[PDB]
Design an enzyme around this catalytic site. Structure first.
Site, PDB file in Angstrom:
ATOM      1  N   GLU A  68      10.729  44.233  60.968  1.00 40.73           N
ATOM      2  CA  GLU A  68      11.824  43.613  60.234  1.00 40.73           C
ATOM      3  C   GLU A  68      13.053  44.499  60.340  1.00 40.73           C
ATOM      4  O   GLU A  68      13.059  45.626  59.835  1.00 40.73           O
ATOM      5  CB  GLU A  68      11.442  43.399  58.775  1.00 40.73           C
ATOM      6  CG  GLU A  68      12.398  42.496  58.024  1.00 40.73           C
ATOM      7  CD  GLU A  68      12.055  42.370  56.555  1.00 40.73           C
ATOM      8  OE1 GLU A  68      12.396  43.284  55.778  1.00 40.73           O
ATOM      9  OE2 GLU A  68      11.453  41.347  56.172  1.00 40.73           O
ATOM     10  N   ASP A 116      15.856  42.602  23.111  1.00 41.02           N
ATOM     11  CA  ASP A 116      16.513  43.681  22.391  1.00 41.02           C
ATOM     12  C   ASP A 116      15.600  44.880  22.199  1.00 41.02           C
ATOM     13  O   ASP A 116      16.073  46.015  22.091  1.00 41.02           O
ATOM     14  CB  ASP A 116      17.029  43.179  21.041  1.00 41.02           C
ATOM     15  CG  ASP A 116      15.931  42.612  20.178  1.00 41.02           C
ATOM     16  OD1 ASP A 116      14.856  42.297  20.724  1.00 41.02           O
ATOM     17  OD2 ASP A 116      16.141  42.480  18.955  1.00 41.02           O
ATOM     18  N   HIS A 132       5.855  44.334  49.864  1.00 35.41           N
ATOM     19  CA  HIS A 132       6.028  44.997  51.151  1.00 35.41           C
ATOM     20  C   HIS A 132       5.019  44.496  52.173  1.00 35.41           C
ATOM     21  O   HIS A 132       5.386  44.125  53.294  1.00 35.41           O
ATOM     22  CB  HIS A 132       5.889  46.509  50.993  1.00 35.41           C
ATOM     23  CG  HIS A 132       6.877  47.115  50.051  1.00 35.41           C
ATOM     24  ND1 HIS A 132       8.238  46.979  50.211  1.00 35.41           N
ATOM     25  CD2 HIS A 132       6.701  47.871  48.944  1.00 35.41           C
ATOM     26  CE1 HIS A 132       8.857  47.620  49.237  1.00 35.41           C
ATOM     27  NE2 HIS A 132       7.948  48.171  48.456  1.00 35.41           N
ATOM     28  N   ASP A 177       7.193  46.080  57.625  1.00 33.40           N
ATOM     29  CA  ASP A 177       8.313  45.952  56.695  1.00 33.40           C
ATOM     30  C   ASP A 177       8.698  47.361  56.273  1.00 33.40           C
ATOM     31  O   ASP A 177       8.156  47.910  55.316  1.00 33.40           O
ATOM     32  CB  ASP A 177       7.964  45.101  55.512  1.00 33.40           C
ATOM     33  CG  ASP A 177       9.056  45.090  54.468  1.00 33.40           C
ATOM     34  OD1 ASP A 177      10.130  44.519  54.733  1.00 33.40           O
ATOM     35  OD2 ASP A 177       8.851  45.665  53.383  1.00 33.40           O
ATOM     36  N   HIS A 221      35.155  60.744  42.454  1.00 39.17           N
ATOM     37  CA  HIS A 221      34.177  59.666  42.455  1.00 39.17           C
ATOM     38  C   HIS A 221      34.117  59.094  41.047  1.00 39.17           C
ATOM     39  O   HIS A 221      33.724  59.791  40.108  1.00 39.17           O
ATOM     40  CB  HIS A 221      32.818  60.185  42.909  1.00 39.17           C
ATOM     41  CG  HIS A 221      32.740  60.441  44.378  1.00 39.17           C
ATOM     42  ND1 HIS A 221      33.023  61.668  44.934  1.00 39.17           N
ATOM     43  CD2 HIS A 221      32.416  59.627  45.410  1.00 39.17           C
ATOM     44  CE1 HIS A 221      32.878  61.600  46.245  1.00 39.17           C
ATOM     45  NE2 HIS A 221      32.508  60.372  46.558  1.00 39.17           N
ATOM     46  N   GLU A 279      21.956  41.391  61.125  1.00 38.67           N
ATOM     47  CA  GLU A 279      22.392  40.120  60.576  1.00 38.67           C
ATOM     48  C   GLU A 279      23.363  39.459  61.538  1.00 38.67           C
ATOM     49  O   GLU A 279      24.133  40.140  62.215  1.00 38.67           O
ATOM     50  CB  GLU A 279      23.051  40.323  59.209  1.00 38.67           C
ATOM     51  CG  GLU A 279      23.297  39.049  58.431  1.00 38.67           C
ATOM     52  CD  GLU A 279      24.390  39.208  57.395  1.00 38.67           C
ATOM     53  OE1 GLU A 279      24.869  38.180  56.872  1.00 38.67           O
ATOM     54  OE2 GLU A 279      24.768  40.361  57.103  1.00 38.67           O
ATOM     55  N   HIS A 338      10.376  35.858  20.409  1.00 36.60           N
ATOM     56  CA  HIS A 338      11.358  35.145  21.216  1.00 36.60           C
ATOM     57  C   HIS A 338      10.754  33.970  21.972  1.00 36.60           C
ATOM     58  O   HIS A 338      11.292  33.563  23.005  1.00 36.60           O
ATOM     59  CB  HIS A 338      12.030  36.102  22.200  1.00 36.60           C
ATOM     60  CG  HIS A 338      12.738  37.247  21.550  1.00 36.60           C
ATOM     61  ND1 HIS A 338      13.891  37.088  20.813  1.00 36.60           N
ATOM     62  CD2 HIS A 338      12.462  38.571  21.535  1.00 36.60           C
ATOM     63  CE1 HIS A 338      14.291  38.264  20.369  1.00 36.60           C
ATOM     64  NE2 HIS A 338      13.442  39.181  20.793  1.00 36.60           N
TER      65      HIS A 338
END
Ligand SMILES: [Mg+2]
Ligand SMILES: [Mg+2]
Ligand SMILES: [Mg+2]
Ligand SMILES: [Mg+2]
Ligand SMILES: [Mg+2]
Length: 1354
Positions: free
Chosen positions: A750, A1316, A971, A8, A828, A754, A1285
């Site tokens: 890999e 936050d 990986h 990979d 840019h 595509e 939370h």
RNA sequence: GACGCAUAAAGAUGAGACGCGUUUUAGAGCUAGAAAUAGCAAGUUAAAAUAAGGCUAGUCCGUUAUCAACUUGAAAAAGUGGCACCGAGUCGGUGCUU
DNA sequence: CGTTTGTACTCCAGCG
DNA sequence: TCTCATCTTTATGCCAGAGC
DNA sequence: GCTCTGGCATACGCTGGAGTACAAACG
């Protein structure tokens, strides 16, 4: 005993895995060396190597070119001083010495501390007389009095040192220009040449056009309003030829001396003047009015008689600055006395004190002072000047980059003319000084090296040192310009000793045409099957409509050829869709020039035409082209040669001349092109000819065809990819060494390739001309009507951006200039310094001074609010994407933030693709080496190249979910799954090896053809669906759209052989177990740091020992210097240091950072370096080089990586259980599971049921942190934030928990937040603990270790 | 249908130039002042450096790539680490084996 | 009683 | 930031007999 | 004179140096 290797590969990682035939990952006991008591380690043969990504050589190139520029600027000043030296010794012999040592402090100066005049009274008088250098330059240009030689030198040196740009060619003379009122002289000359009572009593001249925005529009309107001429040419037609370009391709308006076209004063305009010189000077007024208008555009000074317009403009800046400053001081005193000190004394604020003495630019100063100006009275004029960007300006600003060198040259020439009367040495070498200013090494000559440069290609006619004045007679410019291109073009791959042909050569065009033409087939009403075109038919078709039409459509082929000649009433053509992609453009271009068709059609003069096209492709300098073409002047008319030297080609082909027309098959005596032009009935195209064993092309190519490091170094392309390539090849070599030196059965890589549907791939590759057409028509502008453009012309970045913006600036509501596009620049949107993104979504064409005030930041909120409507218009018309609109309006959503930084750059995909493609063939060449006579190469090792889509679908279908944020194990897991899926696919379908195994294909294997059905959707869509369905043998239930399901067998066999390929019971368990292995060999490559010595910022003087002298004799405590040096590597020193109130030798052990600057000094003799650093009795044999990321292990398996000599990175991996990883993946991505609604509902129900894993994951993180991270305060903050939370939705809690792994992630500490609360970095800024740790030396795979116990050193 | 052609996206390599920025120095600060300071004046420009530097001394080169440890070596380069099984919190144990 | 290392926090990094 | 030149990866379109 | 690759159905990773304040902690 048989095994496979998975890989990979990424830009900063290479995950690897070794699997056996049963997809199990083996494990071995490994010997660990060193002085520790640990002698063996059990390790799983799975892991990932992490490294810093290879940098591109761009930054080094920019630094090198800047260095060359500084060297040459100093050389220019040295030339000028050498000119002035003998006559300066008369007036002030120490003048240049005082100039050289102006930097030194007074106690360091060997001369008087006042550089110019060498005494206080004269210096103060000079600065009172000439507050700016431009005062002196204007005085010298304008006054006739004999000036001081020192002042003359100062003005000339200022012009030569800062000499303006070279973006404009020709002689933009100021003496015959700068007075736009000479338009009256233009109409006077017109009245002389035009006798039918032309208009002479006009209205106001073009001053109205200048006072408005400059374009065709205002020029036309003002000339119509003020000049109602008797004809279009006089009133408008001729004036633009003196001031503007002309768009239409047709000849010019009604003739005056000849009917041909007109154009602005370009490089070819002088030769275009045949319409009047051979017919008559009206066109001579172009060389006056054009220059006047242009310099009025550059400079806002036209109302003065001065011969120094730039110096006059700068003096006007100075005067307006003085007046505005006085008015501002008065207003501040009488309205805001409390703010006076802040504005005018405090230089930490962005007031005037910070504008002048602080670090505030004029944008900062304007944003500071605008609220002040708005609330006071009498500031209307100041506010107007502020909104116009002309308030309290400096004479040297960011926007001086638009000054051409011709303006400075004009001022310098004026000064030399004025002062040559009094100083004879100025008259003798006026031209030498002018040459010093104007000389510039051609881009095709390169550095003027004499052998010892690896960037130079220049060849010199003689051994003399090159100066600006003998450059022509010492440098061979023709050969240098040839080698400029010859060293960059490719060699033919088939014949690596032959350079490729020009893309526009006639043989290349013929080869392309016949390669496409040899495979088109026609079928009539009566013919049984579609037939090839015969050699005679191909000849006839080429001669009939490839040599008469630039683009050949299928309609023309089936109407002009078939219907009209050798009549078929109706025919069907296969092998081309709507138009031949091939063409003979060079043939038509040379037919236009050389009207002789028989010359081109003749075969004897093919070599001459090839040489002509080669010359036209190598050189763009018209002089060099003329010199090279001069040898053919006896074949063409002088006018034909004048037209040829205009014709300029660029681009090079993929094949050489020896290949396509040089080598011959020994049987038939035919070249490849001869076969293409006629090959009997087989009609083999290029790839069939070079792959036939019956023809000797394949043999000749094969017979026309060291170390790994040298091989990788010699690869072309970016050096960034060389790091990844070499690292993965070394990983494979070590893995082979581990496995008994037996080569792997397979290597699965890999690949980032595509399969796309034909619709998606045709929409993503649509022509950019089509995009511009569809966008412009949407918003209805006539920009294409006014300036028609072809798709080929749109390859120009600026031209493409012009139409993408509808011809308007994206920052100021102004129209751009097509002919003057070089005076605009590409901006840019998100700055280059922040994130590397050169995509069209990031590029904007804007005005130079708009870009250069908009420095290294997104467009300001003011610009965004001014332009949001125009950007919205462009977005609705689809000329800018939604991402581009987001980039432009970045200031509306909080500006730059680390969230924007958190996203893979687009260069990373290209780098990954390049690395993987290279290593595929590197491994295929290194592993499969035994050649065999029966079949050429023996495929001992199969290098399988899997697309990424297969493994990702494997993960998503069978719930081996990937979360890149938990740890670096993904990986290694991706590599393992690659090995598993690739080997399983090869076993289940051994007939896909031709397309999955590297190099195992036969050209045009019709066996893998797709039937006509399922091709009506597209050939790429059929392959997309095929690859989607090729992985169904892993699944059990295959669901149809109508609800029907097929139950696949629980054991998948090979089909023809019957070998078991995938036992869906046990092999899925094997895959699941391996992905839950806690031991994965994650290794971070140790890297000696190279690069810049330190931070580039020069700091002011400071009584500190961190400052570094920026030259040898400049004490940083007096002159300032650099700090923050980069440590190349650390050394473990064990020695004695004199410390204490009573200094005494106390033995000490510590890490000393050897910075990049002092690396060579240390490596020359470490003991002397360390003693000079203050270490006594250094034990030389105990010095240990410790590069960055050196690994140390401490109690409880806690690991630390060496960030520097005084900082550590955390070096552990959190092996989170796979159930928690799956729960995090499913709880996040809550409604974007992309599966069936029933499956999504089931997964949401599973997430809801297992909501208790949130506490379990937090416990995992907390215990791991308490063991190895030891960031107690940050951990308490994390726990408190989680408890706060805990009633948030499960999706949000899971999304934010994934951020918590930033606390535990291997590497440098980083900040993160929990809904936050930002948890900031806990940095390990003490390397004292590792001095007693266990230093781990790790091989490339980390399997082989050496453990050094540093507690035993002392 | 890994070459070639057409189209397109995203990138790369080299050369030639521009404009700033920063740093130190020069551009006499004045008055009341024991003065600590306060009031006022002033400001825009220039020189030089712009990786320390190097030697092959060029109007050249100096930030890319190359680098676990150990043993050989002027260096390229070569050489160094047992296997099977049961298990899994960063690898452990057991049994063969040298 | 005076240095002298650990934490802890803040700021910064040449550019268009 | 500008000018000039060269190069790479990937995607789509065109290009596919043949022995049994 | 033809099926074949297959099954028969589809929309790549990310911070170290420097300064300042303050508190143990050794000499
Ligand atoms: Mg990958
Ligand atoms: Mg910009
Ligand atoms: Mg990876
Ligand atoms: Mg490096
Ligand atoms: Mg292709």
């Amino acid at each position: 005993k048989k095994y496979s290797i998975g890989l990979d590969i990424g830009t900063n990682s290479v995950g690897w895995a070794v699997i056996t035939d049963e997809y199990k990952v083996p494990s071995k006991k490994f010997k660990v060396l060193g002085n520790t008591d640990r002698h063996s380690i059990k390790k799983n043969l799975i892991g990932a190597l992490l490294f810093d990504s290879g940098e591109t050589a761009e930054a080094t190139r920019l630094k090198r070119t800047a260095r060359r520029r500084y060297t040459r600027r100093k050389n220019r000043i040295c030339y000028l001083q050498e000119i002035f030296s003998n006559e300066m010794a008369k007036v002030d012999d120490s003048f240049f010495h005082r100039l050289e040592e102006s930097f030194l402090v007074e106690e360091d100066k060997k001369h008087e501390r006042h550089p110019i005049f060498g005494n206080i009274v004269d210096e103060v008088a000079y600065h009172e007389k000439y507050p700016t250098i431009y005062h002196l330059r204007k005085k010298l240009v304008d006054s006739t009095d004999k000036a001081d030689l020192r002042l003359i030198y100062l003005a000339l040196a200022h012009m030569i040192k800062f000499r303006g740009h070279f973006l404009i060619e020709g002689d933009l003379n100021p003496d015959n220009s700068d007075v736009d009122k000479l338009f009256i002289q233009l109409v006077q000359t017109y009245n002389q040449l035009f006798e039918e009572n032309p208009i002479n009593a006009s209205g106001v001249d073009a001053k109205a056009i200048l006072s408005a925005r400059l374009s065709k529009s205002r020029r036309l309107e003002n000339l119509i309003a003020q000049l109602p001429g008797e004809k279009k040419n006089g009133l408008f037609g001729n004036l633009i030829a003196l001031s503007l370009g002309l768009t239409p391709n047709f000849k010019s308006n009604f003739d005056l001396a000849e009917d041909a076209k007109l154009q602005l004063s370009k490089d070819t305009y002088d030769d275009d003047l045949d319409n009047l010189l051979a017919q008559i000077d009206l066109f001579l007024a172009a060389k006056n009015l054009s220059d006047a208008i242009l310099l009025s555009d550059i400079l806002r000074v036209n109302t003065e008689i001065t011969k120094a317009p730039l110096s006059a403009s700068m003096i006007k800046r100075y005067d307006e600055h003085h007046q505005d400053l006085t008015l501002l001081k008065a207003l501040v005193r009488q309205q805001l006395p409390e703010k006076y000190k802040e504005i005018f004394f405090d230089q930490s604020k962005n007031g005037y004190a910070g504008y002048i003495d602080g670090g505030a630019s004029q944008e900062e100063f304007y944003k500071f002072i605008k609220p002040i100006l708005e609330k006071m009275d009498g500031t209307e004029e100041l506010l107007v000047k502020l909104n116009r960007e002309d308030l309290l300006r400096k004479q040297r600003t960011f926007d001086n980059g638009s000054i051409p060198h011709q303006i400075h040259l004009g001022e310098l020439h004026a000064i030399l003319r004025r002062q040559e009367d009094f100083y004879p040495f100025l008259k003798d070498n006026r031209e030498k000084i002018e040459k010093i200013l104007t000389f510039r090494i051609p881009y095709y000559v390169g550095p003027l090296a004499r052998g010892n440069s690896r960037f130079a290609w220049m060849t010199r006619k003689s051994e003399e040192t090159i100066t600006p004045w003998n450059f022509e007679e010492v440098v061979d410019k023709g050969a240098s310009a040839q080698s400029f291109i010859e060293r960059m073009t490719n060699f033919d791959k088939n014949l690596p000793n032959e350079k490729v042909l020009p893309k526009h050569s006639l043989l290349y065009e013929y080869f392309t045409v016949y390669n496409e033409l040899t495979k088109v087939k026609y079928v009539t009403e009566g013919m049984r099957k579609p037939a090839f075109l015969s050699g005679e038919q191909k000849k006839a078709i080429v001669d009939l409509l490839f040599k008469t039409n630039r683009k050949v459509t299928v309609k023309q082929l089936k109407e002009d050829y078939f219907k009209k000649i050798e009549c078929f009433d109706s025919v069907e053509i296969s092998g081309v869709e709507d138009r031949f992609n091939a063409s003979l453009g060079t043939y038509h271009d040379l037919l236009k020039i050389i009207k002789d068709k028989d010359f081109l059609d003749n075969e004897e003069n093919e070599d001459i035409l090839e040489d002509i096209v080669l010359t036209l492709t190598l050189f763009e300098d018209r002089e060099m082209i003329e010199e090279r073409l001069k040898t053919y002047a006896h074949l063409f008319d002088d006018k034909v040669m004048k037209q040829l030297k205009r014709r300029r080609y660029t681009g090079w082909g993929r094949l050489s001349r020896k290949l396509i027309n040089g080598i011959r098959d020994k049987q038939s005596g035919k070249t490849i092109l001869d076969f293409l032009k006629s090959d009997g009935f087989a009609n083999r195209n290029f790839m069939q000819l070079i792959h036939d064993d019956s023809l000797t092309f394949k043999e000749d190519i094969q017979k026309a065809q060291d170390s790994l490091h040298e091989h990788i170094a010699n690869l072309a392309g970016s050096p960034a990819i060389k790091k990844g390539i070499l690292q993965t090849v070394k990983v494979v070599d070590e893995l082979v060494k581990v496995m008994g030196r037996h080569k792997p059965e397979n290597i699965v890589i890999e690949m980032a390739r595509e399969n796309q549907t034909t619709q998606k791939g045709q929409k993503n590759s649509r022509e950019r001309m089509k995009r511009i057409e569809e966008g412009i028509k949407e918003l209805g502008s006539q920009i294409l009507k006014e300036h028609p453009v072809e798709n080929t012309q749109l390859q120009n970045e600026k031209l493409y951006l012009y139409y993408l913006q509808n011809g308007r600036d994206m920052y100021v509501d102004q129209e751009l200039d097509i002919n003057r596009l070089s005076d605009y620049d590409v901006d840019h949107i998100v700055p280059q310094s922040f994130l590397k993104d050169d995509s069209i979504d990031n590029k904007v064409l804007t005005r130079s001074d708009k870009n250069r005030g908009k420095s290294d930041n997104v467009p300001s909120e003011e610009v965004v609010k001014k332009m949001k409507n125009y950007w919205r218009q462009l977005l609705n018309a689809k000329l800018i994407t939604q991402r581009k609109f987001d980039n432009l309006t970045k200031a509306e959503r909080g500006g730059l933030s680390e969230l924007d930084k958190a996203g893979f750059i687009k260069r990373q995909l290209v780098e990954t693709r390049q690395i993987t493609k290279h290593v595929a063939q590197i491994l295929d060449s290194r592993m499969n080496t035994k050649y065999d006579e029966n079949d050429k190469l023996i495929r001992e090792v199969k290098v399988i190249t899997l697309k990424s889509k297969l493994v990702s679908d494997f993960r998503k279908d069978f719930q081996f979910y990937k979360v890149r944020e938990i740890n670096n194990y993904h990986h290694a897991h991706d590599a393992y799954l690659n090995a598993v899926v690739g080997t399983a696919l090869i076993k289940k379908y051994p007939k896909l090896e031709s397309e999955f195994v590297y190099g195992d294909y036969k050209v045009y294997d019709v066996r893998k053809m797709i039937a006509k059905s399922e091709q009506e959707i597209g050939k790429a869509t059929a392959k997309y669906f095929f690859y989607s369905n090729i992985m169904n043998f892993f699944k059990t239930e295959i669901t149809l759209a109508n609800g029907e399901i097929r139950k696949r067998p629980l054991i998948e066999t090979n089909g023809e052989t019957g070998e078991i390929v995938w036992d869906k019971g046990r092999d899925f368990a094997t895959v699941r177990k391996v992905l839950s292995m806690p031991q994965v060999n994650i290794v971070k490559k140790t890297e000696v740091q190279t690069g810049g010595f330190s931070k580039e910022s020069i700091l002011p003087k400071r009584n500190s020992d961190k400052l570094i002298a920026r030259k040898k004799d400049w004490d940083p405590k007096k002159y300032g210097g650099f700090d923050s040096p980069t440590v190349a590597y650390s050394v473990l020193v064990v020695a004695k240091v004199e410390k204490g109130k009573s200094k005494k030798l106390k033995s000490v052990k510590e890490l000393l950072g050897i910075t990049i600057m002092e690396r060579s000094s240390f490596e020359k003799n470490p003991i002397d370096f360390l003693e000079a650093k203050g270490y006594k009795e250094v034990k030389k044999d105990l010095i240990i080089k410790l590069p960055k990321y050196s690994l140390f292990e401490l109690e409880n398996g806690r690991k630390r990586m060496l960030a520097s000599a005084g900082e550590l990175q955390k070096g552990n991996e959190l092996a989170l259980p796979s159930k928690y990883v799956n729960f995090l993946y499913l709880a996040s991505h809550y409604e974007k599971l992309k599966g069936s609604p029933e499956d999504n509902e089931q997964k949401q129900l599973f997430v809801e049921q297992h909501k208790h894993y949130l506490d379990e994951i937090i416990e995992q993180i907390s215990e791991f942190s308490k063991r190895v991270i030891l960031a107690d305060a940050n951990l308490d903050k994390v726990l408190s934030a989680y408890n706060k939370h805990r009633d948030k939705p499960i999706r949000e809690q899971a999304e934010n928990i994934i951020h918590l792994f930033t606390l535990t992630n291997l590497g440098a500490p980083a900040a993160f937040k929990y809904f936050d609360t930002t948890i900031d970095r806990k940095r390990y800024t003490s390397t004292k603990e590792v001095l007693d740790a266990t230093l781990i030396h790790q091989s490339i795979t980390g399997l082989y270790e050496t453990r050094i116990d540093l507690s035993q050193l002392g």
